[PDB]
RNA sequence: UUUUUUUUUUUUUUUUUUUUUUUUUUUUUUUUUUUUUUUUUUUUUUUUUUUUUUUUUUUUUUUUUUUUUUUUUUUUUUUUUUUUUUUUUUUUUUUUUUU
């Protein structure tokens, strides 16, 4: 992601912390990550299956 | 609780490649890192050949005694108060396992 726009990019997350893993545990976040997961994975063909 | 490649974006798979090339060979000559000449023990003055000797000697022996670097006497676990004898023990427990 250093290269999303051209060149220039600022890591905000803490290389130790661990507050985001918290969010595994939410049943809506893991519903709409399969979504996009399961969508993305029939269409390889598109310019956002980066994601 | 749930999990169980300290696997994975999709692609890919020589830490291969301009093209041309291939003795980290070559001016031509040459080829003892041989040579003035003449020599060839890093031998020799002539003598000489124990880095032997004054003579005398020949335990780096000895005063005479002596001869456990033994001994007051008594003794002989560098044992012992009595009691004891896991440098065991509250009870409960017994993966320095687990959402």
Redesign the pocket.
């Known amino acids: 992601q250093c290269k999303a726009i051209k060149s220039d990019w600022v890591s905000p997350v803490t290389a130790t912390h661990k507050y985001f893993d918290v969010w595994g545990?939410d049943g809506n976040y893991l519903k709409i990550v399969a979504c996009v997961d399961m969508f993305?994975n029939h269409f390889?063909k598109s310019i956002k299956?980066?994601?």
């Open positions: 545990n993305y390889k299956a980066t994601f």
